Amino acid sequence: GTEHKSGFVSIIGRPNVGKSTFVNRVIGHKIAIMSDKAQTTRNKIQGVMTRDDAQIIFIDTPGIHKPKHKLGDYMMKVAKNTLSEIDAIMFMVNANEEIGRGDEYIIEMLKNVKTPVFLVLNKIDLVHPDELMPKIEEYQSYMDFTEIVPISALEGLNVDHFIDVLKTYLPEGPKYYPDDQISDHPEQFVVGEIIREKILHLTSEEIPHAIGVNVDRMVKESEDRVHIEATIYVERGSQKGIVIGKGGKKLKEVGKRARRDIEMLLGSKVYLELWVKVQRDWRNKVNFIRQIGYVEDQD
Ligand SMILES: Nc1nc2c(ncn2[C@@H]2O[C@H](COP(=O)(O)OP(=O)(O)O)[C@@H](O)[C@H]2O)c(=O)[nH]1
Numbered sequence: 001g002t003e004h005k006s007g008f009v010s011i012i013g014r015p016n017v018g019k020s021t022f023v024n025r026v027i028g029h030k031i032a033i034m035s036d037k038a039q040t041t042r043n044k045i046q047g048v049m050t051r052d053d054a055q056i057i058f059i060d061t062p063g064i065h066k067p068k069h070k071l072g073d074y075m076m077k078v079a080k081n082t083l084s085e086i087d088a089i090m091f092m093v094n095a096n097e098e099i100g101r102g103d104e105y106i107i108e109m110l111k112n113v114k115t116p117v118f119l120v121l122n123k124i125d126l127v128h129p130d131e132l133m134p135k136i137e138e139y140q141s142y143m144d145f146t147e148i149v150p151i152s153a154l155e156g157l158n159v160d161h162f163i164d165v166l167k168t169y170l171p172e173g174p175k176y177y178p179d180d181q182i183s184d185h186p187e188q189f190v191v192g193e194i195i196r197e198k199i200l201h202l203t204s205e206e207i208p209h210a211i212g213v214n215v216d217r218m219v220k221e222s223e224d225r226v227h228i229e230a231t232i233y234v235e236r237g238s239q240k241g242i243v244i245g246k247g248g249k250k251l252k253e254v255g256k257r258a259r260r261d262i263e264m265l266l267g268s269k270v271y272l273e274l275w276v277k278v279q280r281d282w283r284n285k286v287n288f289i290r291q292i293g294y295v296e297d298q299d
């Protein structure tokens with residue numbers, strides 16, 4: 001059934017295990033704006049895999065392979081949060097090497113994580129087929145995994161099957177990054193769709209319910225802190241009370257919930273400003289926008 005899936009996955013593992021090889025294989029042609037414009041939030045979008053039936057956004061976690069003295073108290077909190085918000089974890093491991101401390105350090109960080117962890121044995125091309133099941137068993141002694149999938153990221157052996165399996169674990173969801181619009185960085189579409197989801201929870205309906213979200217600005221204030229301006233657009237000012245509510249109470253709750261989901265996923269602390277505006281037809285028209293709503297969220 002023809003029902004579109006989308007989500008956030010993080011590819012974790014020690015250096016030289018194949019993470020960028022995998023990313024660059026599956027994502028296809030690299031998005032141009034991602035190397036013009038730097039991303040304001042912390043947790044870097046690696047790229048966008050779009051098939052007809054699904055879209056996956058690859059997010060960087062912090063270096064959970066690192067020992068605790070190198071990745072501090074704060075960047076652990078960011079890493080554990082990001083791993084919860086994410087839809088799936090790709091734990092990528094070298095088939096051709098013995099288990100080092102870096103993989104034990106990752107296993108420690110995945111202990112009280114409830115997100116699906118996929119064990120991806122990479123570099124199976126450097127190894128006899130009968131070597132895979134013993135190595136799988138080495139890792140299974142440490143923890144349970146959701147699926148175990150041997151690949152070669154370089155050759156492409158078993159990659160498409162891995163993606164088919166990975167897609168089954170995604171929720172139903174929007175195409176975050178579209179084909180029409182090359183101009184803005186995909187982080188803006190991630191924030192835009194998060195805001196929109198919080199609005200559509202309130203609607204919760206099959207009254208025909210048209211609402212839009214624009215993100216007017218995203219600005220890095222610090223390595224932790226980002227300022228988002230966004231305008232929610234509605235038809236009909238009587239949509240106050242779906243969206244603004246009794247003295248702004250409903251718009252605060254949207255602002256609070258969207259701020260949290262942006263902080264947890266993308267790893268930067270936010271100062272969110274939301275506007276709510278009514279848009280009538282604009283083509284050859286004067287005074288088609290009336291504001292009905294403003295909120296401010298932080299700390
Ligand atoms: N033989 C083999 N080499 C691979 C495979 N995947 C990646 N490599 C190579 O192993 C290295 C891994 O580096 P990279 O992909 O940058 O991994 P990262 O540090 O995890 O991003 C590169 O020299 C890749 O060409 C694979 O499946 N088989």
Ligand SMILES: [Mg+2]
Binds near residue numbers: 016020
């Ligand atoms: Mg590398």
